[PDB]
Amino acid sequence: MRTLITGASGQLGIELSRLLSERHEVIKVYNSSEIQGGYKLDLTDFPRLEDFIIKKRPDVIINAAAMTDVDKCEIEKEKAYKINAEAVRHIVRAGKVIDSYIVHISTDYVFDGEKGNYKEEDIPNPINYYGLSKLLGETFALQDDSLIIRTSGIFRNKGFPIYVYKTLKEGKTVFAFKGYYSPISARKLASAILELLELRKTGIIHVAGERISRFELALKIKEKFNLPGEVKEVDEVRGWIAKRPYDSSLDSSRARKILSTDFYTLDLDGMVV
Numbered sequence: 161m162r163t164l165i166t167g168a169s170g171q172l173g174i175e176l177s178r179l180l181s182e183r184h185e186v187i188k189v190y191n192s193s194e195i196q197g198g199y200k201l202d203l204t205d206f207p208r209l210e211d212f213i214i215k216k217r218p219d220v221i222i223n224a225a226a227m228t229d230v231d232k233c234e235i236e237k238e239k240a241y242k243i244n245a246e247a248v249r250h251i252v253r254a255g256k257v258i259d260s261y262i263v264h265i266s267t268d269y270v271f272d273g274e275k276g277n278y279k280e281e282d283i284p285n286p287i288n289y290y291g292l293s294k295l296l297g298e299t300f301a302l303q304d305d306s307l308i309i310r311t312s313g314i315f316r317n318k319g320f321p322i323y324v325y326k327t328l329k330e331g332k333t334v335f336a337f338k339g340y341y342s343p344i345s346a347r348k349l350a351s352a353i354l355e356l357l358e359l360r361k362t363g364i365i366h367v368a369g370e371r372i373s374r375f376e377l378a379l380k381i382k383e384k385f386n387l388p389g390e391v392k393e394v395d396e397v398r399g400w401i402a403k404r405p406y407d408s409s410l411d412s413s414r415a416r417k418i419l420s421t422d423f424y425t426l427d428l429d430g431m432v433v
């Protein structure tokens with residue numbers, strides 16, 4: 161009842177739970193993936209969601225829950241909307257009743273990727289439905305006293321660095337999208353969010369890694385671990401349904417001033433196996 165973490169069972173949520181539990185009374189919500197001491201709750205059951213919030217009385221809600229499979233979002237748009245956008249409306253509504261501090265997690269895929277180095281005030285223009293559903297959630301989350309944290313390429317037990325490590329280790333070819341983003345480990349992102357909490361920051365804030373291409377990232381991890389298997393850069397990845405933004409890197413300069421911790425230097429040790 162200090163802090164509700166939705167998406168507690170996901171990459172960011174696991175790490176948030178670990179760190180917040182130090183200081184810090186934590187309510188951990190999962191749906192499909194059971195976690196120790198968690199509460200099972202489907203955020204698309206809106207009355208059950210609102211009741212849960214009003215009953216548990218979190219001082220703080222961190223909304224990390226989402227449908228993050230980009231290609232699945234492109235086909236199952238109704239499902240993506242309900243969790244990535246509409247649930248946020250209900251989190252905000254119930255939160256307001258208890259005057260909770262709402263921290264909502266968003267994505268670099270809200271941008272069209274034609275510019276890169278996006279700052280907080282740059283205008284979203286998503287080119288895939290994951291990005292659009294998330295942008296609609298941002299829109300519901302926009303409140304005088306809420307905080308939207310946009311991030312990029314969260315990695316822990318999944319995300320691109322893991323796909324690279326597992327694929328190359330088995331001698332297979334990695335097809336690396338020609339384009340940039342700003343990958344941050346779940347643990348570094350969690351550490352930043354903890355700092356932000358104490359501060360009761362409001363508005364929008366970018367918290368992500370250094371700008372890097374998928375190709376360089378893949379080859380760094382190949383070099384790091386002398387992995388076999390080839391890295392091939394491709395203009396378009398075969399099998400992809402959704403279009404990815406060319407350069408969705410974020411400009412996190414504001415957060416770099418605010419926060420003490422280096423959340424941005426590439427953290428490959430944040431990979432989980």
Ligand SMILES: NC(=O)C1=CN([C@@H]2O[C@H](COP(=O)(O)OP(=O)(O)OC[C@H]3O[C@@H](n4cnc5c(N)ncnc54)[C@H](OP(=O)(O)O)[C@@H]3O)[C@@H](O)[C@H]2O)C=CC1
Nearest residue numbers: 167169170171172191192193202203225226267311313314
């Ligand atoms: N992953 C990435 O590359 C990036 C992610 N983001 C954003 O960061 C946040 C965290 O992402 P990440 O940790 O990687 O995502 P994960 O895919 O690892 O976790 C998704 C979480 O959402 C929960 N969830 C999904 N649907 C529901 C639902 N219907 N009801 C309750 N919980 C649900 C899942 O719970 P369960 O498994 O228990 O069902 C899981 O805890 C998200 O907001 C994401 O959009 C932003 C930029 C990059």
